[PDB]
Amino acid sequence: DILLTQSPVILSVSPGERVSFSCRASQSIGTNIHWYQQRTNGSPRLLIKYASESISGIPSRFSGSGSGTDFTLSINSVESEDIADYYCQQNNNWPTTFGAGTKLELKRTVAAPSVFIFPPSDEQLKSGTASVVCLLNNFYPREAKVQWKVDNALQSGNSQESVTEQDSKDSTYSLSSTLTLSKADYEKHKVYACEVTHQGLSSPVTKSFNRG
């Protein structure tokens, strides 16, 4: 089988910049290569067929070049919505095979998160568990620190974080941190605090509530 090697693994660029994706084949494949875009939660979208040939409905900023073993997909002026994974596929030799993909990430100015905290619902407490959620909304860059405190006790090991993919319009991330306690623990304590550290904040932001 033909091995396709895509480089780099991750491309980070600013809007309006030129960008190019490389796909190298383990042996010559002529111009028998197709390119795909895959957005978050989406299925692959055919961008270019046979190395350089255009596809109806695909914006003019996408083009391809190359023959033999070295192929290039170009975006001449990247837009925010071009955020995606990009794949090459060869079909000179059976079976058709795909590259491992290049992730395109977009740069933007620093944006501080808006922080919100949510107490557990009374509904959940009935089941014997308490989830406390801290939301960090629309920030950049991705790096953030969330520190949980319960009655000034630093919490460790009992929270999980999840981060969205970059927004297609403003290029920001959002993050949730969920602190999970047994109902009994939750009822034993009063002050629940989420402290957020991020590059766009001059000092940490704390959101908190008092149970009841």
Binding site: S43, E123, S162, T178
Partner: protein, 216 residues
């Protein structure tokens, strides 16, 4: 319009078989081949096989002895079946159609079917509100907790509300059950006049829940 629509996400037990239906429209199966491609953590995009216009099949080398593709032209249905699934067969499975009858440039794709290979039982989620408590903007959400397997779909107000929505990737808990939150920001003044409902659908357990979220 050319479309391919696949059957719902499903849990498959180790050593058991996987069955997926691709139902096409906007073209005849007598005129195009339908290919199957999967995407897994360990293998990425991987072509599995094809059923041609005339009913012939080719299967990729590693799958010749456990893969079966059939179809019903009159029903516009293609049937994918794979045997003896192991945990590394956990993947999103796609059907796809090429630009022409004989080729492999995949211009049209199904929405994909997420298959989880696990001995565990299916479980429906609980849905709890994240109640609105800055700058006239209020955040609210739903905590969709303790379900298996992935995925769940979440929309707001039956699809009418999309702006400012963030549905976070699920995280696997130590219980071996998934959990995720979906949040949205809205003007705080609309909290008293609009209703906010997260529509949750966990297809593998056939669980649909609409949770209304209100200021506490």
């Amino acid at each position: 319009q050319v479309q391919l629509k696949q059957s719902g996400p499903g849990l498959v037990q180790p050593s058991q078989s996987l069955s997926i239906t691709c139902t096409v429209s906007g073209f005849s199966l007598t005129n195009y081949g339908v290919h199957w491609v999967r995407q897994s953590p360990g293998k990425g995009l991987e072509w599995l096989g094809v059923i041609w216009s005339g009913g012939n099949t080719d299967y990729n080398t590693p799958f010749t002895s456990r893969l079966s593709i059939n179809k019903d032209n009159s029903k516009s249905q293609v049937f994918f079946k794979m045997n003896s699934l192991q945990s590394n067969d956990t993947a999103i499975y796609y059907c796809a159609r090429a630009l022409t009858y004989y080729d492999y440039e995949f211009a049209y794709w199904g929405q994909g079917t997420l298959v989880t290979v696990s001995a565990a039982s299916t479980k429906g989620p609980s849905v709890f509100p994240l109640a609105p408590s800055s700058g006239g903007t209020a955040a609210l959400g739903c905590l969709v907790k303790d379900y298996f397997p992935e995925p769940v779909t979440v929309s707001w107000n039956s699809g009418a509300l999309t702006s400012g929505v963030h549905t976070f990737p699920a995280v696997l808990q130590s219980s071996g059950l998934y959990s995720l939150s979906s949040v949205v920001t809205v003007p705080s003044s609309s909290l008293g006049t609009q209703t906010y409902i997260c529509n949750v659908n966990h297809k593998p357990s056939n669980t649909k829940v609409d949770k209304r979220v209100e200021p506490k």
